[PDB]
Structures are given as structure tokens and as C-alpha cells.
């Protein structure tokens, strides 16, 4: 559950995550 929120901050570190 709360899957919609936590797949969001995968999003936010891919961004500059590498």
C-alpha cells in the first residue's frame, strides 16, 4: 500500500541519483 507515494520519490532520486 501507499504505493503511489512511494513510487513518486523513486522518481525525485532518479533524477539525480545516477
Keep these: 500500500a501507499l504505493d503511489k507515494l512511494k513510487e513518486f520519490g ?6 539525480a541519483r545516477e
Excluded at 10 to 15: A, F, Q, R, W
Design 10 to 15: 523513486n522518481t525525485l532520486e532518479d533524477k
